[PDB]
Each structure stands twice: as C-alpha cells, then as structure tokens.
Design a protein around this ligand. Structure first.
Ligand SMILES: [Mg+2]
Ligand SMILES: [Mg+2]
Ligand SMILES: [Mg+2]
Length: 282
C-alpha cells in the first residue's frame, strides 16, 4: 500500500513578514494548547499571537517592563489546573527573561530564579513542557532543566554536553528526554536522572534536525529542511528508523520546532517565510 507525502492542511501567516493580526515577523517558537489554539512567539512584533479563533488575539505589549514582551523567542504551554504560558524573551538588561501568563493572556509573574542569572549567562536553545506540567529547558552549555514555575524550583537538571553538540528542540515522554542535535545530525536520549541512553538517527537520515515530538504511542518524529523541503523522519521507541516523509508541494527552509496534535496533524513554524504550517496526519 502507498504512503502519502506531507500535505498542508492550514496556516497562520501570509508567507511574508507583517505587523497585522494575520501575520508574523521573524517568529521563533510556538506551542500547542489544550484546544486547537496555537501560540506563536512572534519575535519582531514583540508579542505572542494566539491563533485558532476566527479572530486571532495577542499576549503582551512591546517593552521590557513586567507583562511586556521584547523579542520573544519561545512560548510553552504548561498543563495543570488551568493552562498557563511561559514566554522567554529579552529583558531590559538584554538577557533571557521568563514570564508567566494565564490562559486568557493576563500577566501573572516574572519567573525569578538563581538558575536564570548564572555568571555564565543562560541562552535557551530548546524549551518544552514536561508531561507533569514543568518547564523543560536546554541551554547552549548543554544543561537540561526541569522547572516548577510555582515554587519556583529546579526539580531536576543534568549536563548533556558530553554527547550534545547543539540543541535545536526537546521533548519529554515518560521519563525520557529527547533532544535534537543540530550539530551531530541525530537525537540524544536521556533519563530524567541524566543518564545517556542512546542516540537516534544519523547524518544520512536526520541531517540538521530542527524539531522533535513523541507520539502517543512513543514513536519519535524528527523534522529537518535539509535540501529546502520539510522532512519528518519517524523512529520506533527503540530508535529503529521506520519511514521518512517529505513535503513536495513547495520549498521550505529555516523551520523551528515540531509538534503532533492530538488529532495527529503535524505542526512546524517556518521562520524564513513568517508562517506557521499545519500538515495532515501521517
Ligand atoms: Mg509591515
Ligand atoms: Mg504588508
Ligand atoms: Mg517539538
């Protein structure tokens, strides 16, 4: 039986940069919500866009005071009693800032933690939500953190730098943390105690990976645009290559992230053409 290519289902954006409520400008991250809504860190509009409703809406006003956003890069939905959103952006000191917003966009608090003001600085290369509602971060030093935003507290952290060249995305499923390695063309897999388990993929299968997610059955999906077409490569939970899907309808480059929706639709963000793309289930 034949297997289909990737096919576009829906979009947010116009394939060109803009400042209007239907457009993005150099967007740098996104997340799924508990509904069909998708939130986008719309970097050069200094806002988070919420798409999904007939009329999109936005979180934040531009700036560096509490509740304002400045070059937001990542947005993470934390599952719990109610959904809350972490936004990572640039603070007034030019360094990483983390803020918490509630489900309808109101500012809650700035996340102030020792882990966010280290001497060495913190540049976040990947962020996701853990299954239990924690914020999962990977930094450019190779440190991996799981953060309870309420205490706030680092509940666990470890050093991935022996194996990890450069993180581009991260996902957690069960007790395992999967990090796409943009430098080594593979996925690095760890336990939450920091034990390295295995790598998945290789240059011939997962070149320059930019996104990862894990399906409800534990299959690992890894996205790249090497050669200027989106590819989604599927691995079994043990790392066996299953199938590589290609998007042939049009060219894409400089994509960021990957998420599987509950319905199976596949989501990535194209920074190059300022557009979020949703594809039919694989
Ligand atoms: Mg304009
Ligand atoms: Mg225009
Ligand atoms: Mg992902």
């Amino acid at each position: 039986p034949r297997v289909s290519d990737l096919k576009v289902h829906s979009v947010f954006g116009t394939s060109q940069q803009g400042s209007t409520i239907r457009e993005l400008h150099c967007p740098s991250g996104f997340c799924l919500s508990d509904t069909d809504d998708i939130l986008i860190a719309d970097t050069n509009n200094h806002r988070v866009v919420v798409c999904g409703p007939p009329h999109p809406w936005k979180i934040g006003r531009p700036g560096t005071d509490d509740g304002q956003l400045c070059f937001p890069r990542k947005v993470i939905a934390l599952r719990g009693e109610a959904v809350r959103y972490v936004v990572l952006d640039k603070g007034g000191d030019g360094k990483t800032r983390a803020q918490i917003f509630e489900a309808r966009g109101e500012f809650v608090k700035r996340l102030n933690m020792m882990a966010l003001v280290p001497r060495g600085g913190i540049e976040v290369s990947a962020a996701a939500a853990t299954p239990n509602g924690q914020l999962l971060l990977v930094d450019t030093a190779g440190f991996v953190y799981s953060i309870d935003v309420d205490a706030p507290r680092v509940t666990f952290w470890f050093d991935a730098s022996t194996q990890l060249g450069e993180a581009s995305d991260v996902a957690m499923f069960d007790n395992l943390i999967y990090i796409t390695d943009f430098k080594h063309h593979c996925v690095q897999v760890y336990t939450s105690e920091g034990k390295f388990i295995r790598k998945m993929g290789e240059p011939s299968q997962t070149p320059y990976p930019i996104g990862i997610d894990v399906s409800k059955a534990g299959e690992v999906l890894v996205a790249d645009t090497h050669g200027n077409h989106l590819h989604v490569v599927v691995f079994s939970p043990e790392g066996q290559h299953i199938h590589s899907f290609t998007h042939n309808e049009f060219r894409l480059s400089r994509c960021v992230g990957l998420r599987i929706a509950k319905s199976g639709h596949i989501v990535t963000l194209c920074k190059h053409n300022h557009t979020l793309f949703v594809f039919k289930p694989l």
